[PDB]
Amino acid sequence: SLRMQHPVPKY
Amino acid sequence: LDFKRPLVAEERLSFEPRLPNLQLRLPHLVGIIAKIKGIKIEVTSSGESI
Amino acid sequence: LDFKRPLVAEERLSFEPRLPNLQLRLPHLVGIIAKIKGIKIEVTSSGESI
């Protein structure tokens, strides 16, 4: 198991 | 490429297999060994000694 | 072996492909390289440098 938070652009 | 969110699915009884885990030690220079052959080569066995 | 003269055909609309032409440069000793492996071996890529 591995839970991660990928950042994404919001402009 | 686009990784989509999946459609919600109903649970049912599973028959998925669960294999044993395994730890595997490779040679220090495995990259050089694979390179100089130019082909897919056997390097070790699952149980082999150092 | 015998190369016959073919039967006259009727022409129809063609859908044959026509590929681009391509110049390729090979290593000077390519015949020695292929020899000492004893197996079909990669020698270059279409766009590679000298």
Next chain:
Amino acid sequence: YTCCATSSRVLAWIFLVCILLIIVLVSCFVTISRIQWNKDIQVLGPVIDWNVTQRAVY
């Protein structure tokens, strides 16, 4: 004359010492590089276990 004769003698001694040192330097490098290659061959290599959690990067 004597300065020239002396300069020629001193020049030859330093020129001789220059080369005897280069012989030594190259002889050492070939020895050490070859031995380190032998040692490199016999070190323990990596371990794989398919564990994703172990290779997380935050």
